[PDB]
Amino acid sequence: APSPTAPEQPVDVEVQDLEEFALRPAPQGITIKCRITRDKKGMDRGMFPTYFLHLDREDGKKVFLLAGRKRKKSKTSNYLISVDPTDLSRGGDSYIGKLRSNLMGTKFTVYDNGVNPQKASSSTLESGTLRQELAAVCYETNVLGFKGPRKMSVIVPGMNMVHERVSIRPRNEHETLLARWQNKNTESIIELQNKTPVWNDDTQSYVLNFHGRVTQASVKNFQIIHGNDPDYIVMQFGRVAEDVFTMDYNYPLCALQAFAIALSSFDSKLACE
């Protein structure tokens, strides 16, 4: 008697500590399905919106995971990412990570809530208090926007063989995620990119298969892959309504990397949506 083949059933991952969850790589074989809600409360007053990440459960329940919001006054551009929604949405500054862009809008870095290595701190520069780099996002600029979707590359800390994330605590400009990519120090990192949208001559549009989870065309819709493994979707992000988007991630990413990446797409100068 041969054994039956059963269909794979999705199981709801559970959440205890939110910070612990947010840094935990999606396990092998498991997709963490979420939605991001842009809350426009306060925009009438000149306030940047708060974005809420909720786990999108099979039973239909929505479990709060993270919130993100752009800081009022910086002459670059940055977001705080927090496990306290009230504090973030109401003007506070507690955070487990933060998303920083360059002047141009084309480069972003995701850090954790450790110490900036430019604070006059000699004491700290040595073990475990220093700022961790979690992700770097780079957006390509183009020739008047040559009738083509956004191109992005994403760099993250590499994984060990017990499938946990290394740690990258840059002490100088030489050791950032962006630096190691540019200088081809690729032992300690992973290079991801957005999956190429395929031009469809019938629809006269660029398309990807989001498998039912994205329903509206948008310049912000994307999927992230390892370049040499294009069938395996590492994360996907896309519009389902005016102020709501899905966000799904897989190994190696954790919620905070994926959310941070998604948030970077909302900022963009070349501001389109």
Side-chain angles (χ1 to χ4, degrees), residues 1-72 74 76-118 120-172 174-269 271-272:
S3 332
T5 295
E8 195 177 297
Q9 283 311 140
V11 59
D12 285 324
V13 295
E14 210 109 344
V15 185
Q16 354 308 144
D17 184 59
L18 297 182
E19 190 174 347
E20 248 135 24
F21 190 83
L23 312 162
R24 178 155 67 241
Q28 179 277 126
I30 305 275
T31 298
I32 307 286
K33 288 144 61 201
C34 317
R35 18 190 86 206
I36 292 187
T37 303
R38 179 169 47 206
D39 184 2
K40 304 228 265 31
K41 202 87 167 175
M43 296 195 48
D44 68 317
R45 297 173 183 201
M47 217 96 239
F48 291 111
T50 297
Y51 298 90
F52 297 103
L53 179 68
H54 280 88
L55 186 72
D56 197 346
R57 285 173 132 244
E58 303 300 340
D59 53 34
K61 306 299 186 317
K62 270 83 200 94
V63 174
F64 169 80
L65 292 182
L66 287 170
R69 176 187 228 199
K70 194 169 163 161
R71 286 193 103 151
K72 286 156 172 131
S74 17
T76 51
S77 193
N78 55 98
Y79 292 71
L80 297 182
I81 297 159
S82 179
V83 297
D84 191 344
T86 298
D87 175 86
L88 227 226
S89 63
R90 303 277 181 80
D93 73 342
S94 61
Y95 69 99
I96 67 170
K98 73 211 295 177
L99 172 71
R100 182 172 206 69
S101 93
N102 67 0
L103 285 167
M104 321 287 93
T106 56
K107 303 199 180 300
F108 296 77
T109 304
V110 187
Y111 307 100
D112 80 343
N113 65 340
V115 176
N116 192 331
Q118 291 131 134
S121 27
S122 175
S123 150
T124 316
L125 106 97
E126 272 126 308
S127 75
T129 19
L130 259 192
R131 211 167 53 169
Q132 196 149 314
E133 260 175 46
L134 258 23
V137 179
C138 178
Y139 287 89
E140 178 153 17
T141 307
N142 258 99
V143 194
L144 233 40
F146 78 170
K147 191 183 320 88
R150 237 105 77 81
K151 278 204 176 185
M152 52 196 294
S153 42
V154 171
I155 293 154
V156 294
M159 310 302 285
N160 70 27
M161 318 106 340
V162 100
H163 299 148
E164 281 300 328
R165 193 171 46 257
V166 124
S167 195
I168 299 228
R169 295 194 166 76
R171 282 169 292 167
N172 45 117
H174 208 341
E175 323 185 306
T176 58
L177 292 175
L178 290 163
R180 299 170 184 251
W181 177 41
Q182 295 179 18
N183 301 117
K184 307 217 156 68
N185 297 149
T186 66
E187 72 268 327
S188 33
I189 60 169
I190 295 172
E191 207 235 299
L192 273 10
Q193 60 197 70
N194 70 296
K195 183 174 201 185
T196 301
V198 8
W199 175 254
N200 187 315
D201 235 332
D202 295 318
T203 53
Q204 292 288 119
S205 65
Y206 291 93
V207 315
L208 291 176
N209 194 342
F210 299 93
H211 295 100
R213 296 224 84 219
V214 172
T215 51
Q216 292 185 355
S218 172
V219 151
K220 295 164 184 33
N221 295 342
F222 63 81
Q223 296 178 320
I224 302 293
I225 56 160
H226 299 88
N228 67 354
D229 189 10
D231 299 320
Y232 173 62
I233 306 307
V234 176
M235 81 173 278
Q236 84 167 22
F237 171 72
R239 173 182 274 200
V240 297
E242 180 64 43
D243 291 313
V244 21
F245 296 76
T246 51
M247 185 201 95
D248 302 337
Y249 65 97
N250 282 119
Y251 181 90
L253 294 181
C254 65
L256 178 61
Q257 296 169 302
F259 189 45
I261 288 160
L263 281 179
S264 80
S265 93
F266 285 103
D267 207 56
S268 278
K269 303 136 208 188
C272 209

